Design an enzyme around this catalytic site. Structure first.
Site, short mmCIF file in Angstrom:
data_model
loop_
_atom_site.label_atom_id
_atom_site.label_comp_id
_atom_site.label_asym_id
_atom_site.label_seq_id
_atom_site.Cartn_x
_atom_site.Cartn_y
_atom_site.Cartn_z
N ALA A 185 -22.26 -11.67 -22.57
CA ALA A 185 -20.98 -11.24 -22.00
C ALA A 185 -19.82 -11.99 -22.65
CB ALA A 185 -20.97 -11.47 -20.48
N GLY A 186 -18.71 -11.28 -22.88
CA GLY A 186 -17.55 -11.93 -23.49
C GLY A 186 -16.37 -10.98 -23.56
N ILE A 187 -15.17 -11.59 -23.61
CA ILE A 187 -13.91 -10.85 -23.69
C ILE A 187 -13.00 -11.53 -24.70
CG2 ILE A 187 -14.06 -10.08 -21.28
CD1 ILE A 187 -11.85 -12.17 -20.61
N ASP B 268 -6.12 -11.57 -26.92
CA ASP B 268 -5.45 -12.02 -28.14
C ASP B 268 -3.95 -12.18 -27.94
OD1 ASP B 268 -7.95 -11.72 -29.26
OD2 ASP B 268 -7.41 -10.01 -30.52
N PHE C 185 -6.64 -15.92 -36.65
CA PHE C 185 -5.25 -15.67 -36.27
C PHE C 185 -5.14 -14.90 -34.96
CE2 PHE C 185 -1.05 -13.83 -36.40
CZ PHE C 185 -0.28 -14.76 -37.06
N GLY C 186 -4.27 -15.37 -34.07
CA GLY C 186 -4.04 -14.71 -32.81
C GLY C 186 -5.12 -14.91 -31.77
N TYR D 274 -9.98 -17.52 -27.93
CA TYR D 274 -11.30 -17.01 -28.28
C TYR D 274 -12.01 -17.92 -29.28
CZ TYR D 274 -14.65 -13.32 -29.77
OH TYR D 274 -15.76 -12.58 -30.07
#
Ligand SMILES: NC(=O)c1ccc[n+]([C@@H]2O[C@H](COP(=O)([O-])OP(=O)(O)OC[C@H]3O[C@@H](n4cnc5c(N)ncnc54)[C@H](OP(=O)(O)O)[C@@H]3O)[C@@H](O)[C@H]2O)c1
Ligand SMILES: NC(=O)c1ccc[n+]([C@@H]2O[C@H](COP(=O)([O-])OP(=O)(O)OC[C@H]3O[C@@H](n4cnc5c(N)ncnc54)[C@H](OP(=O)(O)O)[C@@H]3O)[C@@H](O)[C@H]2O)c1
Ligand SMILES: NC(=O)c1ccc[n+]([C@@H]2O[C@H](COP(=O)([O-])OP(=O)(O)OC[C@H]3O[C@@H](n4cnc5c(N)ncnc54)[C@H](OP(=O)(O)O)[C@@H]3O)[C@@H](O)[C@H]2O)c1
Ligand SMILES: NC(=O)c1ccc[n+]([C@@H]2O[C@H](COP(=O)([O-])OP(=O)(O)OC[C@H]3O[C@@H](n4cnc5c(N)ncnc54)[C@H](OP(=O)(O)O)[C@@H]3O)[C@@H](O)[C@H]2O)c1
Lengths: 234, 245, 237, 240
Positions: free
Chosen positions: A87-89, A92, A146-147, A151
């Site tokens: 699981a992950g999100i 950004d 980047f951005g 994360y």
């Protein structure tokens, strides 16, 4: 019969992992998010394709939620031999524009899940002297991203967890590894940075994960397995 | 039909690799050293176990020997799809005591082989738009090791080669990867005194045992499969937890 | 007074290293290649700028040459406390087109130098329980580079050497480290090289030399076996 | 005159950093924890030793606290050129025994601080086209760390942050780097002798001043080409 639990097991990479582990002969349980509006639909389509999965609601960012989920999984299967922390999100934003909420949401879901989920299954693996724990990182935990200050931090942090738990469990028949995929087909600025010139297929990553969960991979532990099309090397 | 060529294919790790690739359905050619005195015996035992290999003499430290070897491999099999650069030696000594011969022997066999062997098969892989090149490194390339200034240097250098060739071949359907094993149950370990095995070697390994050649071979077989085309330029650590980074 | 020996000490990066070590108070010896046609010119201009160097011919690809060179250095300076393995070459070619001579030239100059040069000075460092050995690698040893199968391998191999020698010497007051620069302003950059460098400029040799001067100081005795990246962000891991 | 702000500036490593940056000619502000009971005495002793510091209370785990602190630092000094994210804690336990409290305390102090603190100073560095951001990691973010699943994760996560911020700021004269110290002379003697020193090739703990000296170099005008890097100063305890 080996039992696997795949968090995010109905998502893009997670579904591919679940199918590969099922086809390797494992009994497979999947988690789904509270917001998931297609739980029964997904299970029906997988059954039509020949695979019986069982699904369990969880918020991997919440320890008590993981407790309730694990109680149900263990009630149905009796044990979990193989845990895929998938699981992950993302949330950004450039660091200058990133909010505390953006930061926290990624940290709690992508990194705290290592603690919240694995705590519920580690005791049984240690007791039975067998386990496979695979934590899904990212090429962007390795390369500059980047951005993605949140994360990249969370995904880099995952490998610190992997290495510690690998050391703590090495004499109990358990392995703990990080799999770091590149960009997956799950994009005119991305493809030029991928030497093989294509996105990765979720099924390819799932195939590597199935090898790591096999009886042939007991000497791989504490490792970061990079499957990124050459996008990052070091 | 996919063709594999395994250098050092009759050694401890190489034999395990050859078996796994054969069992995956590949046609397997193995190299042997020029003075290998047990080639026929090795082939017979493998045949008795149900596997037919073809064996070819080579000195991987010598470009012309590699040329002559590859000529014979390609005459028999027509192509090489999968190259396992596995042949290797040690010549351990503290740097203070290490000789020029110790250094050169390890550099030429363990690192120059990257050039001498791979140059003979790369053109065909490039034209056919498919290949798998797997270079056997070592945990000691990653962490350094007392007495191994030559060997750690050569094994570290192998991964620099891996990354460059991966970049140059990535759009030709070829992957190039380094596999870095920890201590394995082979002859190098079996010549070690028991007290040293117990007190010096095994405590280095968190899982508490040596790695089996067949385990490393199983990982290599995955890398040579149609499921591993997205793994390239990587260094895959299979070391029992001996080293992490 | 610490003595430093800088191979390739008159080249782009080497000259900057030699100046920084001199300014840190070291007595500095530099090597020059056998066919270097400007040795006395270089020494005079450095003296004009206030720094007295001594120069010694060497072929770092040849053990015998390194023996002869070290003999001369030790005769004049008595000892070498600080060794900078900086001499290096490229011989770029795609792997398909690369010749055995391309491979061998880079391997013998860039990687065999670890043995040929350091063998001549390691005993004195061990005997005196002090030393600094800094080996110049490359960002391209870390990320690999098109056309550099030989150079990337040699530069990656250098760090395997660093780690082993660090382990062997750590209890004798010696440190061994790799410094891996990115692209430097040494003797189409806007379209090919600069876009790969996040800081948007080439590195200055003096910047790399400043980092090396730190590693050679009495404040860096706890840095050993490391690979110090100074590449403007071109590679991270 | 370059202005530095050192979180945890009165602790073991932090005090050594603050002294080195002061001696390099910077004007140095230090943070202290809210319940630090020795701020006045610490400042007096540094003053007697010839160094004038200014001190500021902060909880690096709390964004609003970081805001108040930074606003006062910037009011007093007008800018911050150099930021050392050095505050940190451990809450060691084996994974089986570790609590959510152990995990959260280390995550919020050691990793969330990267966001909470740096967010308050980044805009000024970008506007002035100069910055040095040094984030203190650990050898145990690289090597396997028994009994430290929380600390190893937080410290490894720091370098992910370093690399992203390095990329986003590289055109603005800002560098962002991780410094990863080994074990420092800042634990039972039997654990030091059996578990720690045998794993350090140089055979001793590191001195805080040694790490501070490397940080001083990274914050200098000679280190503008070092960014997104992890600088290991660990006595050889980890190599890769
Ligand atoms: N896609 C890529 O290119 C790529 C590359 C490298 C790494 N990854 C990693 O691969 C993993 C899988 O992502 P994906 O690519 O498959 O994306 P995805 O399709 O969006 O799947 C993400 C999964 O996370 C689950 N999830 C998210 N937050 C959750 C929470 N709080 N509690 C429980 N479940 C939660 C979702 O569950 P539901 O489906 O039930 O809502 C979903 O299955 C992630 O860890 C991602 O970081 C992806
Ligand atoms: N054993 C371990 O613990 C370990 C750990 C990490 C990495 N490795 C690597 O694994 C690889 C295989 O080693 P091993 O453990 O299987 O040892 P091994 O039994 O001694 O095998 C070494 C092989 O190298 C071949 N060889 C050596 N020099 C050669 C030359 N000049 N030309 C042609 N062939 C040559 C030998 O061929 P013949 O048998 O025909 O003489 C032999 O098969 C090596 O690259 C080694 O560095 C081993
Ligand atoms: N420039 C960059 O962008 C860059 C980036 C990363 C790493 N590096 C490394 O930096 C080091 C210095 O190179 P550079 O950039 O300063 O280039 P350079 O100006 O061409 O210098 C190369 C040096 O190597 C010496 N040399 C070459 N072959 C030799 C041999 N066989 N024996 C003795 N000396 C020999 C030369 O000596 P003479 O001058 O006496 O002929 C020269 O000083 C090299 O190791 C290189 O790999 C450079
Ligand atoms: N010691 C080592 O061997 C070692 C090795 C590698 C890395 N490190 C890192 O070095 C850094 C400094 O630690 P140290 O060794 O100097 O230990 P230390 O003496 O215990 O200092 C830790 C510092 O963190 C500050 N702090 C803790 N929680 C805080 C919070 N919530 N808000 C604000 N300040 C807070 C403390 O402030 P007050 O003093 O004002 O209370 C203190 O100055 C840490 O990041 C640590 O992880 C240490």
């Amino acid at each position: 019969k080996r039992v696997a639990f795949v968090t995010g097991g109905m998502g893009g990479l997670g579904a591919a992992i679940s199918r590969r582990l099922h086809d390797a002969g494992m009994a497979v349980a999947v988690s789904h998010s509270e917001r998931n509006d297609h739980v029964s639909t997904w299970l029906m389509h997988e059954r039509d394709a020949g695979r019986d999965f069982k699904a369990y609601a969880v918020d991997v960012a919440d320890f008590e939620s993981c407790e309730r989920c694990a109680e149900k999984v263990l009630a149905d299967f009796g044990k979990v031999d193989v845990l895929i922390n998938n699981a992950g999100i993302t949330r950004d934003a450039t660091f200058m524009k990133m909010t505390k909420g953006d930061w926290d949401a990624v940290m709690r879901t992508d990194l705290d899940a290592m603690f919240n989920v694995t705590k519920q299954f580690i005791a049984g693996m240690v007791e039975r002297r067998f386990g496979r724990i695979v934590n899904i990182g990212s090429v962007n935990g390795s390369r500059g991203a980047f951005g993605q200050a949140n994360y990249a931090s969370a995904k880099a942090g995952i490998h610190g967890f992997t290495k510690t738990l690998a050391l703590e469990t090495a004499k109990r028949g358990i392995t703990v590894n990080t799999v770091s995929p590149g960009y997956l087909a799950t994009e005119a600025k991305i493809l030029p940075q991928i030497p093989v010139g294509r996105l990765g297929r979720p099924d390819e990553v799932a195939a590597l994960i199935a090898f790591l969960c096999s009886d042939d991979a007991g000497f791989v532990t504490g490792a970061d397995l990079a499957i990124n099309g050459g996008m990052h090397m070091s």
